[PDB]
Write a protein that binds this ligand. Structure first.
Ligand SMILES: Nc1ncnc2c1ncn2[C@@H]1O[C@H](COP(=O)(O)OP(=O)(O)CP(=O)(O)O)[C@@H](O)[C@H]1O
Ligand SMILES: Nc1ncnc2c1ncn2[C@@H]1O[C@H](COP(=O)(O)OP(=O)(O)CP(=O)(O)O)[C@@H](O)[C@H]1O
Ligand SMILES: Nc1ncnc2c1ncn2[C@@H]1O[C@H](COP(=O)(O)OP(=O)(O)CP(=O)(O)O)[C@@H](O)[C@H]1O
Ligand SMILES: Cc1ncsc1CCO
Ligand SMILES: Cc1ncsc1CCO
Ligand SMILES: Cc1ncsc1CCO
Ligand SMILES: [Mg+2]
Ligand SMILES: [Mg+2]
Ligand SMILES: [Mg+2]
Lengths: 510, 511, 510
């Protein structure tokens, strides 16, 4: 026997016999990754060849102290004395299954939505002693969290969790990283690979690899210091962020809709850094390669979800993206298109206005502080919420993740959030590409940071310089038209003078 | 719950959802059908829709007092208080299953070979409390008996049986009828039907029609007297037989190899009947419709199994008689197949072969040929003829009788009527070609002549004399091979027109 | 250099790069069969990869003392100093080629017809120093000989010959065997394999194999003594042929047209041996396997050339066929169908009447003796020519063949030919299947022979017993109809009495 409690879901290898590399058995693979938990899925063979393959492997496994788990069948295992069974949502009811296998056998369940964890919990312990969460990629992380959360809300502590579907080395760290509860108390208990150890020409190696990622603790997703800063941003600091980004001249690639095209192009080389509006898929790897490049990502744009994914990755592969979802919560179509981009990579910063920043937090004023803080954490990013008060929460937690210990209780309630204001300036809401352009700005700051830089300040820097240059234009203008041209000026000037002690905006604490 | 001893396998409906007539449910069909025993096959669906589906039906059955059985899915079975579970030769080991389901519950097993009945028995009672015999048609009856036998050679008296695979109304009586143990003590306990109640646009009526056949007990496969005759054929009888076939002038169609083409052509119109040598398919249904038609069937011939099955079926659809001459049952791999295959296309009125061929058909000296003839003629429910120095003529039709699992009231392969027709050494008879093909043409002509009140046995025995008779004569009147043949045909031509069987050379003994 | 005269064409390996078994080079193959002459054919690559592959191999070869020969090119070789070149009929003119490569270089030519050897010879020596004869199988042997003959008729002694196209172990002996001149002086100088050594998984082995066959001397094609008998057949002998074939009961399979079907069936078991008319392809191997089986082959029959080839081979594979070509020289279609069967296997005996026996000899009375003798030799068989005098020539030469030394001068003029007569019996020409039935007879004799038997006498036996039983019937009959039935009798009787001292026919010498 095994005790439910000795079940280590670290790296959970689920098989699919029909996809084995030639000149290699299944026993041959499952052995390799055993030397670096295991379930069997055979939804096709003869339930006798099933029982033979299963016994042959149940013994390999017990030699390594690891248990064995079976699929759609509740006859087989029983008949071969297996350690547990894992059924999908359209397989057999969870009560019936316990009535046969009785207490003492690990029961896996596939959970995609939360109405399912509400069920899972309306059954108590000794039924569903774990679950494999939805199908991340073919819902992604965002959905993984709606679940990890219905767990806490239901205090379902007995049930563990393993992430399943789409997992690879080119995305594992990220799944493990942003797949933490909303309260930060519960993360994922493990990962399920398939086409990664099974279909591998050398499963000795690949299993080592996926181990390297799984029990590391450090997702450095961007080459900029992620340390949690509690102390407001200091004049000397904003000053050096600018001095950096000027000395640096970040190449900021703009994938964006058409209105912001010219505007943001200037707002960029006004900040004294070169811009590139390229929506060509073959370049994305050549650009992201350039010394200080930085990616501005706008939604709505005329570009296809293929090339957006190509870029989000092209940069992540080299370690800093700024993402502007506009609207991202207006129409059905925008809703999708964003959520889909949001599973492609890991973003350095998500900047949105009060509608967008509530939509992402999953639907006033204190509210907007609660909200930015969610979105900052949920997507492990510095989130920015543009308004009369720009709020700037930091949810990156230094790049830390763990298995099922979550984050040392660092909820979506207690992360560093701030406030940048200079009172009523309605006439910033009456220019186009205004928020899109706070993006180009935030973006230039982040790009100019060196390794030892700090990501939070570079954003909090950007939001000042902009709110600052925005108070000015608003004064020196006759309306909208001129407002824009005086804003681009106020930026071109504010920066070359580089004397932050001047700047309009007051920086509070949330 | 049911007691194993309460399962009536009569009509055993095994489902397959993915073939339901539109504007009809499964419940919908399985309800007309319970107006016995039901099994549920879902080798595709979701184990959960499965379970819901299994429950919807378990009630339906229990309402008509009939039980339900699952398939491969032993868990589903347990899970829903299923009455039995039926698994295949490559599904879960029987032991394992009994370990989980434990006694009280029925276990079906798909059997097809005898090696499998042996295993079945080396496990004894309370394990496999019934089997489903192979796939009859896509092996056949021949190989259903091979198992029915191993079952009796292993007194596995607990194990019930059901025939399955290809079972339709155009072949159910034949299957029930010739699927009996070699000792005539055990027959099939019931039938499995699938495509025929389910895909029916009127399951209500298809179930009735399958009842009709299944518990009836009379397969009148040929429109001739099948009574078990025990007294030797009498001269008055062989005389009337001839008088009948002369006066009715039977049509004898000849599917036969190329040498026997002209020979038996004459041997036929020399027996006062007309011969057709047609291997045309379009025709068969037209010919076998002629008032006295009869089919003589040789092998090796150039025609395709397609047309042969076309023809065998043709005549059987109309209860007209078939004569079968399997050339070299073991001659060569290829012929072996061909024949074992045709032997499952219909119900023969007579099988005729030499010693080798009749040892081939009995399934491998002198007393031996009597035993063997009795076997071949019982196995395939027919009057079978082994030719040699002595011709032996066993009757195996048991009067067209069949029953369910009561087999045949203990009438084995050993105590059917077998006789014998010798007239001394005539070596010169096998030294002419188509001699056995031509004994057929004769047997074919004599059965052709028979009317309803006729009698199939005596009619075979008639032709075997007439032949061996004209055999003796031709031999005495020749000077070689070539001359022998022309004296034979002539001997026949004369013998009959004078029809005085008081004269004839050949002595009719008992086996 | 190599001297034309040191060129040993034993086993001539011509390449086709594009058909090499994986994990095996071409160098890798050509080496193997070198350790057990060689030409290169590359009608596709770049004439530079050609020149590299060629040099790489020209050196492998010279290490084994073997020369190298090239294909359609007269530039390459020259450029790579090769030992010879082999051009087809649609390649470059043979004069032009000599004008470039000049004397001293072996020039191969592909010759299929004889108008080509007439050309080949209208050029003298030093041009075409060899030829590869037609394309045997995809014309066959029969055509190989029309050529080997236009050689002699032209006394072209300089030119050697190699057989090419279709050669394999399952037919090599036969090609080498019946491919002898008409005068017996010149046989084939060697064989060309391709898809046999090149495409082989183990070319070490296969090259050994094709060597075993090539420089052996003994084609035992039938399990019956082939010795050349000069002494007429003796009564005691005919007597024992019968005693044998009766004691034996040969299973004689009859593939034949429909008229002879019944007749010959009797004429068979009259000779007290069992007959089988089977035209089913799946049986041919089961029958030919039976203790004393023997094949009767009739033309015209309703059977397809596929199943005829299946049988001719099925028997040859087990070692005795009797072949009756009727007509075989009437219509265009018959003409083909026969010539085609005549390349499928090796026949123990070819029985034909005076039209058929002239047609085969390639178009009176002395003539018919000259003719049967040709056909007997040409197809390395005992040929029988039915007439008023049945002639019986023996052209098997004991199963001997050699490379290019032919047969020790044993022409188509000087083989054992005889004559069986019993004067005018017109009424044998007025029954059907008469010659077809001499076949069934000849056939039963041959079948009953044991290893130590002799094939010539068994035929010469058959032709008596038949001419004998034919004189009788002709006497004891009223016309045709009865003639047949008294003939079948005379055979049934003649044999069981077995007292040859009686028999009508006189056996002369041709
Ligand atoms: N009433 C106000 N008072 C002070 N600043 C304001 C303001 N309204 C807008 N802003 C400033 O302008 C920026 C963006 O404007 P907004 O809140 O409308 O986002 P948005 O996504 O709608 C821009 P777009 O026009 O490209 O869609 C902010 O970052 C903020 O600093
Ligand atoms: N030695 C013998 N003595 C007496 N009768 C014999 C005999 N051999 C054959 N016969 C007779 O000839 C008929 C068939 O004999 P047999 O069975 O040996 O031929 P067969 O089946 O090989 C015919 P085919 O040539 O079509 O294959 C019978 O009616 C039988 O009585
Ligand atoms: N004028 C004659 N005198 C003696 N024998 C003769 C004869 N004419 C035919 N025969 C005999 O009959 C045999 C075959 O007859 P034939 O020479 O016509 O060959 P064939 O191919 O024409 C026969 P088929 O009728 O089957 O086509 C010979 O082997 C020979 O012994
Ligand atoms: C900066 C930029 N990026 C893509 S196009 C473009 C405009 C060239 O002036
Ligand atoms: C008897 C026969 N059968 C088909 S055709 C035929 C020829 C007519 O004498
Ligand atoms: C001898 C023979 N061969 C194939 S059929 C046949 C006729 C069966 O009497
Ligand atoms: Mg915006
Ligand atoms: Mg027979
Ligand atoms: Mg002929």
């Amino acid at each position: 026997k095994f005790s439910k409690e000795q079940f280590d879901y670290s790296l959970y290898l689920v098989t699919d016999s029909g996809m084995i590399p030639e000149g290699k058995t299944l026993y041959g693979q499952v052995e390799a990754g055993l030397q670096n938990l295991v379930q069997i899925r055979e939804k096709d063979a003869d339930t006798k060849f099933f029982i033979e393959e299963a016994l042959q492997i149940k013994e390999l496994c017990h030699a390594h102290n690891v248990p064995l788990i079976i699929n759609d069948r509740i006859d087989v295992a029983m008949a071969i004395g297996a350690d547990g069974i894992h059924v999908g949502q359209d397989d057999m009811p969870i009560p019936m299954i316990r009535k046969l296998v009785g207490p003492d056998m690990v029961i896996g369940w596939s959970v995609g939505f939360p109405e399912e964890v509400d069920e899972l919990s309306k059954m108590g312990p000794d039924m569903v002693d774990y679950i494999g969460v939805g199908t991340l990629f073919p819902m992604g992380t965002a959905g993984a969290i709606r679940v990890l959360d219905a767990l806490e809300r239901n205090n379902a502590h007995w049930c563990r969790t393993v992430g399943i579907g789409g997992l690879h080395p080119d995305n594992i760290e990220r799944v493990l990283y942003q797949c933490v509860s909303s309260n930060g108390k519960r993360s994922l208990d493990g990962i399920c690979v398939v086409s990664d150890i099974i279909a591998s020409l050398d499963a000795a190696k690949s299993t080592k690899i996926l181990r390297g990622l799984i029990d590391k603790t450090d997702y450095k997703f961007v080459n900029i210091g992620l340390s949690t800063k509690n102390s407001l941003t200091t004049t000397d600091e904003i000053q050096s962020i600018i001095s950096n980004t000027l000395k640096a001249r970040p190449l900021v690639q703009h994938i964006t809709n058409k209105v912001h095209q010219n505007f943001g192009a200037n707002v960029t080389l006004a900040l004294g850094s070169s811009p590139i509006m390229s929506e060509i898929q073959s370049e994305v790897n050549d650009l992201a390669a350039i010394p200080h490049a930085t990616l501005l990502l706008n939604t709505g744009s005329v570009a296809p979800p293929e090339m957006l994914k190509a870029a989000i990755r092209a940069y992540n592969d080299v370690k800093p993206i700024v993402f502007d979802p506009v609207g991202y919560s207006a129409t059905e179509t925008r809703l999708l298109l964003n959520n889909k981009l949001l599973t492609f990579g890991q973003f350095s910063c998500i900047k949105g206005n009060s509608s967008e920043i509530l939509g992402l937090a999953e639907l006033s004023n204190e509210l907007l502080i609660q909200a930015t803080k969610i979105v900052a954490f949920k997507y492990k990013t510095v989130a920015v919420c543009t308004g009369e008060f720009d709020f700037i929460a930091d949810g990156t937690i230094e790049g830390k993740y763990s298995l099922s210990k979550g984050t040392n209780g660092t909820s979506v309630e207690d992360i560093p959030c701030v406030a940048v204001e200079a009172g009523p300036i309605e006439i910033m809401g009456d220019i186009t590409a205004s928020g899109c352009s706070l993006g180009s700005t935030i973006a230039c700051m982040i790009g100019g940071q060196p390794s030892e830089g700090n990501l939070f300040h570079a954003v909090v820097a950007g939001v000042m310089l902009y709110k600052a240059a925005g108070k000015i234009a608003s004064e020196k203008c006759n309306g909208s038209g001129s407002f824009q041209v005086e804003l681009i000026d106020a930026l071109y000037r504010l920066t070359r003078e580089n004397t932050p002690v001047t700047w309009a905006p007051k920086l509070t604490h949330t």
